[PDB]
Amino acid sequence: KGSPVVVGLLVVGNIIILLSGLALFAETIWVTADQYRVYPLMGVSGKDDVFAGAWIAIFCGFSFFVVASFGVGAALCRRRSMILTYLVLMLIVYIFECASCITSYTHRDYMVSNPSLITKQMLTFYSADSDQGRELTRLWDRVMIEQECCGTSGPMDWVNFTSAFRASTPEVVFPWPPLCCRRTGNFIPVNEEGCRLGHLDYLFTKGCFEHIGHAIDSYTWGISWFGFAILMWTLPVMLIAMYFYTTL
Amino acid sequence: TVRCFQSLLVFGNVIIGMCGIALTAECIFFVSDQYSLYPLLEATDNDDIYGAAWIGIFVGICLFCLSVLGIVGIMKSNRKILLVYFILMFIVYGFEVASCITAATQRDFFTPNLFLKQMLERYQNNSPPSNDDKWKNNGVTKTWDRLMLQDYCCGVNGPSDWQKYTSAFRTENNDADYPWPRQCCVMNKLKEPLNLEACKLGVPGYYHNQGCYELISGPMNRHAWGVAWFGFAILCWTFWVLLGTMFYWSRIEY
Amino acid sequence: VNLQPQLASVTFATNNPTLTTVALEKPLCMFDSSAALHGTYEVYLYVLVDSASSRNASVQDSTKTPLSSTPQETEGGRTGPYKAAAFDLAPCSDLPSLDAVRDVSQASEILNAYLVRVGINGTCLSDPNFRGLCNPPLSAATEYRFKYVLVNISTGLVQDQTLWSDPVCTNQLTPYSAIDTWPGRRSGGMIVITSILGSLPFFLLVGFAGAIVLSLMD
Amino acid sequence: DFNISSLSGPLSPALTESLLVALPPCHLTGGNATLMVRRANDSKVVKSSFMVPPCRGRRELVSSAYQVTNLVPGTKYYISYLVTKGASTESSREIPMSTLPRRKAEAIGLGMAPTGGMVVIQVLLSVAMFLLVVGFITALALGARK
Ligand SMILES: *[C@@H]1O[C@H](CO)[C@@H](O[C@@H]2O[C@H](CO)[C@@H](O[C@@H]3O[C@H](CO[C@H]4O[C@H](CO)[C@@H](O)[C@H](O)[C@@H]4O)[C@@H](O)[C@H](O[C@H]4O[C@H](CO)[C@@H](O)[C@H](O)[C@@H]4O)[C@@H]3O)[C@H](O)[C@H]2NC(C)=O)[C@H](O)[C@H]1NC(C)=O
Ligand SMILES: *[C@@H]1O[C@H](CO)[C@@H](O[C@@H]2O[C@H](CO)[C@@H](O[C@@H]3O[C@H](CO)[C@@H](O)[C@H](O)[C@@H]3O)[C@H](O)[C@H]2NC(C)=O)[C@H](O)[C@H]1NC(C)=O
Ligand SMILES: *[C@@H]1O[C@H](CO)[C@@H](O[C@@H]2O[C@H](CO)[C@@H](O)[C@H](O)[C@H]2NC(C)=O)[C@H](O)[C@H]1NC(C)=O
Ligand SMILES: *[C@@H]1O[C@H](CO)[C@@H](O[C@@H]2O[C@H](CO)[C@@H](O)[C@H](O)[C@H]2NC(C)=O)[C@H](O)[C@H]1NC(C)=O
Ligand SMILES: *[C@@H]1O[C@H](CO)[C@@H](O)[C@H](O)[C@H]1NC(C)=O
Ligand SMILES: *[C@@H]1O[C@H](CO)[C@@H](O)[C@H](O)[C@H]1NC(C)=O
């Protein structure tokens, strides 16, 4: 007739799933809010997942809340057919959240195992006349002077590779974006030769890929590992739930 | 029949819940500080649109749970359940009444005057008296430079304003070289001028030549009508099911 | 003769008379309607300010050679007029198209053909070796008057001249605390929201109480 | 008959195309200098000449290096001086320098290098999917009998 010692296990286990499901619902919405404006940066290369993980997960997290509240109810009520409907709702949310975990992680390394997969976009689209050239140059010229950096390898990407910039900008005048110079509060350059020749202090010398990588990495693990953490609690609760369904 | 009554009740409750979620979503949309706008509003403790929205998040979750509570109660036909339900919703009703009114009270002050004060006072300052005065004098200056340098407007009415009033910028910078912000000339892609003498004179289309009030007001104006009227509609939906539910409750045999 | 200088045309100079500066039209055709163009020529601008003794403003010496007066020795143009700028005589047919000044190539030379600017050079009072015609920032709240004069460079006499301008006023400042940051107005929505959402609670209370009473009855 | 210095302290002097050179010593100042540059593979010398500037000590920024360009990418160039002050003369021995090559943005082969995070997640979760599916199947199998 099923021990109270196992009833309590389903109660605590559902309560833990409930809370971590609500927290995952909150976190995954916080990914989709795009705290760093990287939704433009993915979409030029396409086949996206880092946000698709979150857009799967928001509903999966709220799913975990609702089936788990019901699950606490079913455990106290000890009704055979209610425990069946605990299994046969949870295990679908489970499969969707697996996809959220896998999708969110898999794209991460497909683009931030090395910076060059992102660098290709900057060399193509920076200040470039085509439609997405303007769109993504709004992302970049904001990142640049919001955070003081000239590129992923600072004032050298712009000579380490071919980019749209060369073809409009003969390098003898600017070997790097003019927005790489530090600008006064009047927005004027601090010295001309001091940026056209470039001492290491008037230039924004930092590597921009830190912000881009740390954004992508942080959004990812929030989906991916919190997902696995819910799921690793769901297995033992769902296994105990098999034993409940087969004892009652 | 009574059954029909129950049906009506449950349907209104369902609507209450879906409003809780859609309110939660709307709140998150504005609480996002979406193009910032913290910097123009933390400048005056002009934050009740956001404060209302935060209130909107937790009442939004609260209303969802209370709704299902209600259905559960109605169905279960339990006096105490209904009672508690009543109490809780009453509380939540108060908090969203508060959010509604606080957003609604705030927005009338968003004006071509208010944003012209903060711009004349707090831009390019370099002599603030105190730390949180310097912390406000940064964020205002940054926000005016985002709007002027990418969204191509200048001043609140226009490139008039800097040339008719005293300002923080003005005491730092003499007009003969800085007749209004350098952020207001049209620069070419080298991020230096089309021609500066023509931007000094105001020859039309060498400079950002429109006010920004529309950019500043437009989002704030949506946030305003947004939370407040949606809360009011919920506070009506809840009011008539509260009366009905109460009625039913009262008609419970002991 | 109404040989009067002018504030530069307000069609395309939207901010012109700033707190310390004014742009003026140049003397286009002005000295040359009776065909004066017969050799090299230059023009001086003098600036002056209203005061009772200023009717002694003899912009030339008695022997017809111009005053060598400057912003220092005139105290900003009070104790006499001062030689605020110079340029060469434009031969009238050049007629800058104010419409076409959007050709970024030509823009600066069109402005340099069309006008002169007074107030421009904040530095020039300081440097002890800038032995040039200093065009300093003009003082706020001052009505100025302006006068172009023609000089016959081959013999060194003023040839003839304009009349002083009608008074040109700088921009002048409201102190920024004067901007009443109240609206006076009320929206529409505030008043409905405050009045209805204040009303609603009372009714709920009433109803609740009534519920109580009903349940106590039965 | 000096040796050129190397201003690699304040800046980055190597580049695609243009490079930076130290001015001649203050012994020479007001003198007439010719810089000479030579692409290593060839006899191909190029002359550019200027007066030796007044010694502004260490006051920062002007062309205070000389700048040299049309130094086409990947090329090793030697750099050298001949200078004069009166009928007296001055010199230095060559020094070699090398300019970066060009690289294609479309020649970015995807540097795709998987972390163990991905692969640990995939294995762990595919195992968990398997275990739950199997479990669910076996649970309902047993319950079918009761
Ligand atoms: C606003 O007010 C400022 C400051 O009051 C004025 O700026 C100064 O203008 C004077 C004009 O006389 C500049 O004078 C210098 O004169 C030198 C003359 O030296 C010999 O060499 C020249 C050839 O160059 C011979 O023809 C001459 O006979 C002498 O034998 C020039 O050599 C100087 O040129 C150098 O300095 C300038 C300024 O840095 C550079 O642009 C040149 O490329 C060159 O390096 C110069 O002409 C004086 O230097 C200016 N000072 C400043 C601070 O700018 C403005 O004229 C005034 N503007 C307006 C519109 O009112
Ligand atoms: C430094 O002083 C020397 C010596 O005057 C300058 O070098 C060269 O001097 C010769 C003779 O005075 C000049 O020769 C003539 O050159 C023309 C071309 O400019 C050529 O067609 C004639 O056949 C004749 O050879 C020459 O102009 C001059 N310049 C060069 C580059 O040869 C030198 O220019 C001075 N450098 C500086 C920095 O002033
Ligand atoms: C990308 O840029 C870096 C510098 O940001 C280049 O680094 C070179 O490194 C070697 C060895 O340390 C030095 O001899 C060179 O002087 C460096 N270059 C410069 C400009 O100083 C690096 O070569 C570039 N890589 C690619 C693949 O282009
Ligand atoms: C400036 O005025 C003088 C004086 O009238 C003009 O020069 C004289 O012209 C007469 C008549 O042709 C000649 O007899 C004299 O020899 C001239 N003087 C000299 C010193 O040559 C002069 O033409 C006028 N110049 C301008 C630019 O108007
Ligand atoms: C800077 O702003 C403060 C108020 O925020 C004001 O008191 C001060 O006068 C301003 N600075 C200048 C230079 O006027
Ligand atoms: C050049 O540098 C070397 C090595 O430091 C030094 O021995 C020599 O005296 C210097 N001068 C000359 C003329 O070679």
PDB file of C-alpha atoms in Angstrom, chain B residues 20-191:
ATOM      1  CA  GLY B  20      -1.643  37.324 -14.420  1.00  0.00           C
ATOM      2  CA  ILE B  21       0.742  35.717 -16.970  1.00  0.00           C
ATOM      3  CA  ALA B  22       0.344  38.395 -19.674  1.00  0.00           C
ATOM      4  CA  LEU B  23       0.819  41.126 -17.019  1.00  0.00           C
ATOM      5  CA  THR B  24       3.938  39.248 -15.788  1.00  0.00           C
ATOM      6  CA  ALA B  25       5.263  39.186 -19.380  1.00  0.00           C
ATOM      7  CA  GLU B  26       4.525  42.940 -19.945  1.00  0.00           C
ATOM      8  CA  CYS B  27       6.176  43.797 -16.638  1.00  0.00           C
ATOM      9  CA  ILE B  28       9.324  41.882 -17.565  1.00  0.00           C
ATOM     10  CA  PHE B  29       9.307  43.695 -20.957  1.00  0.00           C
ATOM     11  CA  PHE B  30       9.500  47.114 -19.226  1.00  0.00           C
ATOM     12  CA  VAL B  31      11.516  46.013 -16.105  1.00  0.00           C
ATOM     13  CA  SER B  32      14.129  44.989 -18.714  1.00  0.00           C
ATOM     14  CA  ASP B  33      15.309  48.680 -18.705  1.00  0.00           C
ATOM     15  CA  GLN B  34      15.160  48.066 -22.404  1.00  0.00           C
ATOM     16  CA  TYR B  35      17.280  50.931 -23.911  1.00  0.00           C
ATOM     17  CA  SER B  36      18.297  51.560 -20.362  1.00  0.00           C
ATOM     18  CA  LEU B  37      16.222  54.683 -19.372  1.00  0.00           C
ATOM     19  CA  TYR B  38      17.154  54.080 -15.706  1.00  0.00           C
ATOM     20  CA  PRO B  39      19.653  56.990 -16.314  1.00  0.00           C
ATOM     21  CA  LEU B  40      16.972  59.614 -17.193  1.00  0.00           C
ATOM     22  CA  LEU B  41      14.599  58.505 -14.373  1.00  0.00           C
ATOM     23  CA  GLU B  42      16.912  57.630 -11.419  1.00  0.00           C
ATOM     24  CA  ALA B  43      17.943  61.308 -11.903  1.00  0.00           C
ATOM     25  CA  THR B  44      14.732  62.518 -10.083  1.00  0.00           C
ATOM     26  CA  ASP B  45      13.461  59.387  -8.246  1.00  0.00           C
ATOM     27  CA  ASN B  46      10.996  59.297 -11.179  1.00  0.00           C
ATOM     28  CA  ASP B  47      10.887  55.454 -10.986  1.00  0.00           C
ATOM     29  CA  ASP B  48       7.186  54.575 -10.263  1.00  0.00           C
ATOM     30  CA  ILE B  49       6.612  53.197 -13.774  1.00  0.00           C
ATOM     31  CA  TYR B  50       9.265  50.527 -12.966  1.00  0.00           C
ATOM     32  CA  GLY B  51       8.109  50.223  -9.310  1.00  0.00           C
ATOM     33  CA  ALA B  52       4.575  49.548 -10.547  1.00  0.00           C
ATOM     34  CA  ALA B  53       5.971  46.986 -13.016  1.00  0.00           C
ATOM     35  CA  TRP B  54       7.939  45.126 -10.256  1.00  0.00           C
ATOM     36  CA  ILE B  55       4.708  44.961  -8.309  1.00  0.00           C
ATOM     37  CA  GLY B  56       3.168  43.785 -11.554  1.00  0.00           C
ATOM     38  CA  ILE B  57       5.599  40.792 -11.668  1.00  0.00           C
ATOM     39  CA  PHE B  58       4.753  39.416  -8.210  1.00  0.00           C
ATOM     40  CA  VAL B  59       0.996  40.144  -8.384  1.00  0.00           C
ATOM     41  CA  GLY B  60       1.128  38.485 -11.864  1.00  0.00           C
ATOM     42  CA  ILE B  61       2.414  35.185 -10.362  1.00  0.00           C
ATOM     43  CA  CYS B  62       0.162  35.722  -7.329  1.00  0.00           C
ATOM     44  CA  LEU B  63      -3.004  36.172  -9.446  1.00  0.00           C
ATOM     45  CA  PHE B  64      -2.209  33.011 -11.407  1.00  0.00           C
ATOM     46  CA  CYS B  65      -1.962  30.912  -8.207  1.00  0.00           C
ATOM     47  CA  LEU B  66      -5.049  32.566  -6.714  1.00  0.00           C
ATOM     48  CA  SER B  67      -7.086  31.893  -9.809  1.00  0.00           C
ATOM     49  CA  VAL B  68      -6.440  28.142  -9.690  1.00  0.00           C
ATOM     50  CA  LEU B  69      -7.080  28.403  -5.983  1.00  0.00           C
ATOM     51  CA  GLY B  70     -10.432  29.751  -6.829  1.00  0.00           C
ATOM     52  CA  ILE B  71     -11.393  27.085  -9.241  1.00  0.00           C
ATOM     53  CA  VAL B  72     -10.233  24.516  -6.685  1.00  0.00           C
ATOM     54  CA  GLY B  73     -12.395  26.125  -4.041  1.00  0.00           C
ATOM     55  CA  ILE B  74     -15.488  26.512  -6.099  1.00  0.00           C
ATOM     56  CA  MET B  75     -15.220  22.939  -7.219  1.00  0.00           C
ATOM     57  CA  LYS B  76     -14.415  21.645  -3.714  1.00  0.00           C
ATOM     58  CA  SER B  77     -17.210  23.777  -2.243  1.00  0.00           C
ATOM     59  CA  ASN B  78     -15.186  24.494   0.901  1.00  0.00           C
ATOM     60  CA  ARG B  79     -16.044  27.612   2.884  1.00  0.00           C
ATOM     61  CA  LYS B  80     -12.612  28.128   4.375  1.00  0.00           C
ATOM     62  CA  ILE B  81     -10.890  27.778   1.012  1.00  0.00           C
ATOM     63  CA  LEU B  82     -13.057  30.486  -0.417  1.00  0.00           C
ATOM     64  CA  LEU B  83     -12.423  32.627   2.612  1.00  0.00           C
ATOM     65  CA  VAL B  84      -8.670  32.453   2.355  1.00  0.00           C
ATOM     66  CA  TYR B  85      -8.986  32.965  -1.361  1.00  0.00           C
ATOM     67  CA  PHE B  86     -10.927  36.122  -0.741  1.00  0.00           C
ATOM     68  CA  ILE B  87      -8.380  37.475   1.668  1.00  0.00           C
ATOM     69  CA  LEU B  88      -5.430  36.781  -0.545  1.00  0.00           C
ATOM     70  CA  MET B  89      -6.978  38.251  -3.642  1.00  0.00           C
ATOM     71  CA  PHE B  90      -7.964  41.311  -1.580  1.00  0.00           C
ATOM     72  CA  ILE B  91      -4.365  41.873  -0.669  1.00  0.00           C
ATOM     73  CA  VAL B  92      -3.142  41.336  -4.222  1.00  0.00           C
ATOM     74  CA  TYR B  93      -5.925  43.674  -5.434  1.00  0.00           C
ATOM     75  CA  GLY B  94      -4.537  46.375  -3.212  1.00  0.00           C
ATOM     76  CA  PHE B  95      -0.994  45.955  -4.447  1.00  0.00           C
ATOM     77  CA  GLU B  96      -2.020  46.184  -8.114  1.00  0.00           C
ATOM     78  CA  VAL B  97      -4.332  49.170  -7.283  1.00  0.00           C
ATOM     79  CA  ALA B  98      -1.088  50.683  -5.959  1.00  0.00           C
ATOM     80  CA  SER B  99       0.956  49.799  -9.087  1.00  0.00           C
ATOM     81  CA  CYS B 100      -1.777  51.136 -11.401  1.00  0.00           C
ATOM     82  CA  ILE B 101      -2.047  54.442  -9.576  1.00  0.00           C
ATOM     83  CA  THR B 102       1.748  54.915  -9.082  1.00  0.00           C
ATOM     84  CA  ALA B 103       2.490  54.505 -12.802  1.00  0.00           C
ATOM     85  CA  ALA B 104      -0.558  56.674 -13.672  1.00  0.00           C
ATOM     86  CA  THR B 105       0.455  59.435 -11.216  1.00  0.00           C
ATOM     87  CA  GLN B 106       4.016  59.568 -12.506  1.00  0.00           C
ATOM     88  CA  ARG B 107       3.747  59.971 -16.230  1.00  0.00           C
ATOM     89  CA  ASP B 108       2.025  63.421 -16.433  1.00  0.00           C
ATOM     90  CA  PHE B 109       5.438  64.981 -15.493  1.00  0.00           C
ATOM     91  CA  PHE B 110       7.280  63.556 -18.536  1.00  0.00           C
ATOM     92  CA  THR B 111       7.481  66.830 -20.467  1.00  0.00           C
ATOM     93  CA  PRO B 112       9.668  68.901 -22.816  1.00  0.00           C
ATOM     94  CA  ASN B 113      10.452  70.897 -19.645  1.00  0.00           C
ATOM     95  CA  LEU B 114      11.628  68.022 -17.355  1.00  0.00           C
ATOM     96  CA  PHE B 115      14.063  66.535 -19.856  1.00  0.00           C
ATOM     97  CA  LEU B 116      15.290  70.082 -20.742  1.00  0.00           C
ATOM     98  CA  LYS B 117      16.096  70.666 -17.022  1.00  0.00           C
ATOM     99  CA  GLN B 118      18.207  67.480 -16.668  1.00  0.00           C
ATOM    100  CA  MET B 119      20.060  68.284 -19.936  1.00  0.00           C
ATOM    101  CA  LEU B 120      20.907  71.916 -19.023  1.00  0.00           C
ATOM    102  CA  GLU B 121      21.900  70.899 -15.467  1.00  0.00           C
ATOM    103  CA  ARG B 122      23.694  67.529 -15.716  1.00  0.00           C
ATOM    104  CA  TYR B 123      25.500  67.137 -19.054  1.00  0.00           C
ATOM    105  CA  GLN B 124      29.347  67.463 -19.375  1.00  0.00           C
ATOM    106  CA  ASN B 125      29.447  68.888 -15.823  1.00  0.00           C
ATOM    107  CA  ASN B 126      32.982  68.474 -14.261  1.00  0.00           C
ATOM    108  CA  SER B 127      32.068  70.067 -10.879  1.00  0.00           C
ATOM    109  CA  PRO B 128      29.347  67.948  -9.068  1.00  0.00           C
ATOM    110  CA  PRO B 129      29.102  68.474  -5.242  1.00  0.00           C
ATOM    111  CA  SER B 130      28.719  64.856  -3.998  1.00  0.00           C
ATOM    112  CA  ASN B 131      29.174  61.157  -5.040  1.00  0.00           C
ATOM    113  CA  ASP B 132      25.558  60.285  -5.996  1.00  0.00           C
ATOM    114  CA  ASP B 133      25.405  63.654  -7.799  1.00  0.00           C
ATOM    115  CA  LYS B 134      28.443  62.465  -9.892  1.00  0.00           C
ATOM    116  CA  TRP B 135      26.720  59.046 -10.308  1.00  0.00           C
ATOM    117  CA  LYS B 136      23.642  60.828 -11.789  1.00  0.00           C
ATOM    118  CA  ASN B 137      25.830  63.266 -13.887  1.00  0.00           C
ATOM    119  CA  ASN B 138      27.462  60.294 -15.653  1.00  0.00           C
ATOM    120  CA  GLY B 139      24.307  58.358 -16.665  1.00  0.00           C
ATOM    121  CA  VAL B 140      22.426  61.404 -17.994  1.00  0.00           C
ATOM    122  CA  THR B 141      25.529  62.463 -20.032  1.00  0.00           C
ATOM    123  CA  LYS B 142      25.922  58.939 -21.451  1.00  0.00           C
ATOM    124  CA  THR B 143      22.220  58.708 -22.396  1.00  0.00           C
ATOM    125  CA  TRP B 144      22.270  62.053 -24.178  1.00  0.00           C
ATOM    126  CA  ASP B 145      25.349  60.866 -26.135  1.00  0.00           C
ATOM    127  CA  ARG B 146      23.695  57.551 -27.146  1.00  0.00           C
ATOM    128  CA  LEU B 147      20.668  59.458 -28.483  1.00  0.00           C
ATOM    129  CA  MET B 148      22.734  62.262 -30.149  1.00  0.00           C
ATOM    130  CA  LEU B 149      25.514  60.060 -31.676  1.00  0.00           C
ATOM    131  CA  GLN B 150      23.461  57.124 -33.126  1.00  0.00           C
ATOM    132  CA  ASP B 151      19.770  58.274 -33.140  1.00  0.00           C
ATOM    133  CA  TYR B 152      20.705  61.586 -34.821  1.00  0.00           C
ATOM    134  CA  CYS B 153      18.564  64.122 -32.830  1.00  0.00           C
ATOM    135  CA  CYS B 154      19.790  67.119 -30.746  1.00  0.00           C
ATOM    136  CA  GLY B 155      18.276  68.856 -27.675  1.00  0.00           C
ATOM    137  CA  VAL B 156      14.696  68.333 -26.346  1.00  0.00           C
ATOM    138  CA  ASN B 157      12.996  70.872 -28.612  1.00  0.00           C
ATOM    139  CA  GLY B 158      16.082  71.111 -30.884  1.00  0.00           C
ATOM    140  CA  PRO B 159      19.616  72.594 -31.408  1.00  0.00           C
ATOM    141  CA  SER B 160      17.941  75.840 -30.235  1.00  0.00           C
ATOM    142  CA  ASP B 161      18.049  74.878 -26.568  1.00  0.00           C
ATOM    143  CA  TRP B 162      21.833  74.932 -25.992  1.00  0.00           C
ATOM    144  CA  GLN B 163      21.845  78.471 -27.475  1.00  0.00           C
ATOM    145  CA  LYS B 164      19.022  80.045 -25.317  1.00  0.00           C
ATOM    146  CA  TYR B 165      19.754  78.807 -21.735  1.00  0.00           C
ATOM    147  CA  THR B 166      22.627  78.565 -19.206  1.00  0.00           C
ATOM    148  CA  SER B 167      24.028  74.971 -18.869  1.00  0.00           C
ATOM    149  CA  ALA B 168      26.712  72.737 -17.380  1.00  0.00           C
ATOM    150  CA  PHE B 169      28.186  72.279 -20.887  1.00  0.00           C
ATOM    151  CA  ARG B 170      28.119  76.073 -21.469  1.00  0.00           C
ATOM    152  CA  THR B 171      30.223  76.990 -18.426  1.00  0.00           C
ATOM    153  CA  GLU B 172      32.870  74.419 -19.490  1.00  0.00           C
ATOM    154  CA  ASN B 173      32.837  75.212 -23.270  1.00  0.00           C
ATOM    155  CA  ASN B 174      32.864  78.600 -25.084  1.00  0.00           C
ATOM    156  CA  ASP B 175      30.309  79.014 -27.951  1.00  0.00           C
ATOM    157  CA  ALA B 176      32.779  80.275 -30.587  1.00  0.00           C
ATOM    158  CA  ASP B 177      34.163  76.671 -30.855  1.00  0.00           C
ATOM    159  CA  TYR B 178      31.317  74.760 -29.081  1.00  0.00           C
ATOM    160  CA  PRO B 179      28.017  76.542 -29.998  1.00  0.00           C
ATOM    161  CA  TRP B 180      26.118  73.337 -29.072  1.00  0.00           C
ATOM    162  CA  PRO B 181      27.295  69.677 -28.375  1.00  0.00           C
ATOM    163  CA  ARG B 182      29.859  68.194 -30.866  1.00  0.00           C
ATOM    164  CA  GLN B 183      27.698  65.058 -30.715  1.00  0.00           C
ATOM    165  CA  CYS B 184      25.149  67.098 -32.755  1.00  0.00           C
ATOM    166  CA  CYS B 185      27.205  67.636 -35.955  1.00  0.00           C
ATOM    167  CA  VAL B 186      26.769  65.074 -38.760  1.00  0.00           C
ATOM    168  CA  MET B 187      30.097  63.246 -38.930  1.00  0.00           C
ATOM    169  CA  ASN B 188      31.123  61.154 -41.950  1.00  0.00           C
ATOM    170  CA  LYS B 189      32.238  57.476 -41.387  1.00  0.00           C
ATOM    171  CA  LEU B 190      35.716  58.643 -40.192  1.00  0.00           C
ATOM    172  CA  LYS B 191      33.620  59.967 -37.188  1.00  0.00           C
TER     173      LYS B 191
END
